[PDB]
Design a protein around this ligand. Sequence first.
Ligand code: DUD
Ligand code: DUD
Ligand code: DUD
Ligand code: MG
Lengths: 142, 136, 127
Amino acid sequence: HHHHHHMQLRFARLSEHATAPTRGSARAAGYDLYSAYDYTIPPMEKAVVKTDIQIALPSGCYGRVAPRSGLAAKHFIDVGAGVIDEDYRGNVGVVLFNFGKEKFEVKKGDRIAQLICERIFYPEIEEVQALDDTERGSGGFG
Amino acid sequence: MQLRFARLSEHATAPTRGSARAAGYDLYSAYDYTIPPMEKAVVKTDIQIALPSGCYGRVAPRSGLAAKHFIDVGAGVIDEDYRGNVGVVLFNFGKEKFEVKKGDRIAQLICERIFYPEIEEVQALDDTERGSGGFG
Amino acid sequence: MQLRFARLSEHATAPTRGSARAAGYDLYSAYDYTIPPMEKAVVKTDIQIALPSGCYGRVAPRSGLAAKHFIDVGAGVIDEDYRGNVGVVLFNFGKEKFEVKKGDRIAQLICERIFYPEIEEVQALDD
Ligand SMILES: O=c1ccn([C@H]2C[C@H](O)[C@@H](COP(=O)(O)OP(=O)(O)O)O2)c(=O)[nH]1
Ligand SMILES: O=c1ccn([C@H]2C[C@H](O)[C@@H](COP(=O)(O)OP(=O)(O)O)O2)c(=O)[nH]1
Ligand SMILES: O=c1ccn([C@H]2C[C@H](O)[C@@H](COP(=O)(O)OP(=O)(O)O)O2)c(=O)[nH]1
Ligand SMILES: [Mg+2]
């Protein structure tokens, strides 16, 4: 209209322990997220890792916390939960799963996940009596 | 344009959204399940959905269930053209059994915007700056 | 609106679409793998892809494999500029070995629309 600009990923540090999120290349899908504390995760266990950052996502997306590739392939690390709502203003947490047979050590400053700005719709929901058939139909689960 | 649903029995609950800017609509169990430690279950919602054009439906984990109970969501891709019963694949990685009762909120449904590209084979692709190096 | 791919060996299979409005293209194993219980494997497809601009490629789980065999997909983020071999990280949480045969459908690839905002540090979020 009057103003012509690009939306930014806004963040604020909640402590001196946080690291500003980084992007490897100009077209990496995600911003790197860093642990603010030390964690020791035993075999077949989980931990909630605090980043000590609050974020304000641009309109029309949510923030998906996604796994690092190397951590999954080499160490059997996975990311649980992962849905950061557009209107969340709290401390960003990463839920890490250790499926390996050895303990996994997280140190303050380690890169442990990535944040992706996934574009979504926010549709209104409408109940109907019945839906119409497609070629796929009710065919599911292999 | 909208997310349309229909109930497949009286045991279903209409999906809900806590906020106008919440990513997902909450999905509810229509039945009772006990999931033992290190086991999986397929949870019926007893709804069929018609997703808006230009997206798929991602069944995504609730945060509390993940962080406290070590519950995860398997599979999770609901195609735009799917008209069957929406199932939730729950993985229990915790050491105690996880109880699901009718009416419990067990997952969320996100309308993820996607492309539907046409596929083309070529001999070889040109390299960028990331190269072939992955899994770092 | 165009997804380009090339084969890195004779063992690769061209990605297919399961239905007209399927979210993903089927990805196929190029090799034979035995995954023991509670273990992982990196399954090579022997393809390289060029994603359309404005998306990343998400490697996503097959539903039958999850529901029946307790198979899951780890990692899964393919960056727009990646031109290497597409690897699938398969997790076997089941109690029996899982056998992957050359030519088996093991995952799907979804073109997830994203954007690339610049990052801005503020002191308070309402600055
Ligand atoms: O968590 C899920 C995943 C999939 N489906 C349904 C909807 C989807 O459209 C269909 C996929 O079935 P398929 O194409 O026969 O499964 P596969 O990935 O094993 O080829 O199954 C669900 O209800 N819940
Ligand atoms: O991996 C995650 C997942 C979620 N959250 C935060 C952001 C999100 O907006 C909020 C979700 O809280 P909730 O609505 O109480 O979660 P639920 O109802 O799914 O248990 O928690 C995180 O920090 N990390
Ligand atoms: O399931 C996956 C995940 C990633 N990759 C490739 C593509 C992606 O662009 C690259 C990421 O490598 P990295 O940036 O060095 O990984 P990391 O997250 O460990 O920093 O690896 C795959 O082939 N399959
Ligand atoms: Mg998405």
